[PDB]
């Protein structure tokens, strides 16, 4: 039972998930045998991967993860939205539906921040619960009383397998949210894989707008 | 690539 959260393991089945899942509430600040913090962030990390590799239009949806891969069709001449409702496996929105609180704008200008002439490029759109452990966390929040992932929610996009990519048009993302209390701001960020030891959240080309009912955030990379 | 709001106090 303890075995699961020390190290990683190459299966991302649904059982197998939901084993890994255990550790977003197992691992406490406190030094533990059982967290592996960098292999499970890793394990996490590498999910959005495993989706991509399958070319597979499909849909997860557990308690945790809700998880969308679909491919895009090029020369679309339209901005991509996407509602990232925490509810519900995410979805793309149509033009003359209502925008969602919670949506993601991706513009044209991927495609032409991709390889060659594409025809159609394949997204995976994940929503992931981090609970209240040291997995995705990092050494800025895990101060007490300091600072933390809002909700202890995460959205996961990736397109054409790309590590790092500029955008042309930055990707905005909206989040909907009731004002925090006085002396408590909100800056959102991306997981740098590589921003300290074991990776941290960075602010680095991502501009926040604070709405009154929730953050616009305009980000140049994906 | 992982996106998320992060709560933080006002220094």
């Not at 070319?55 to 491919?71: D, E, H, I, S, Y």
Request: proline share 7%; hydrophobic share 30%; charged share 20%.
């Amino acid at each position: 039972p303890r075995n699961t959260c020390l190290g990683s393991n190459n299966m991302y089945d649904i059982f197998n998930l939901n084993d890994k899942a255990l550790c977003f509430t197992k691992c406490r600040q406190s030094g533990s045998d059982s967290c592996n913090v960098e292999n499970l962030q890793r394990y996490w990390l590498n999910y959005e991967a495993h989706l991509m590799k399958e070319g597979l239009t499909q849909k997860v949806n557990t308690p945790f993860l809700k998880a969308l891969v679909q491919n895009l069709s090029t020369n679309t001449a339209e901005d991509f939205y996407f509602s990232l409702e925490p509810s519900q496996v995410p979805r793309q929105v149509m033009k003359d539906e209502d925008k969602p609180p919670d949506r993601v704008r991706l513009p044209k200008s991927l495609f032409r921040s991709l390889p060659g002439n594409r025809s159609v490029v394949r997204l995976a759109v994940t929503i992931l619960d981090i609970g209240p452990g040291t997995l995705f966390k990092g050494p800025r929040l895990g101060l007490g009383d300091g600072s933390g992932v809002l909700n202890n929610r995460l959205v996961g996009l990736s397109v054409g397998q790309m590590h790092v990519t500029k955008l042309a048009e930055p990707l905005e993302i909206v989040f909907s949210h009731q004002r925090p209390p006085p002396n408590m701001t909100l800056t959102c960020v991306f997981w740098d894989v590589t921003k300290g030891t074991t990776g941290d959240w960075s602010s680095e080309g991502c501009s926040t707008e604070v709405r009154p009912e929730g953050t616009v955030c305009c980000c140049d990379h994906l």
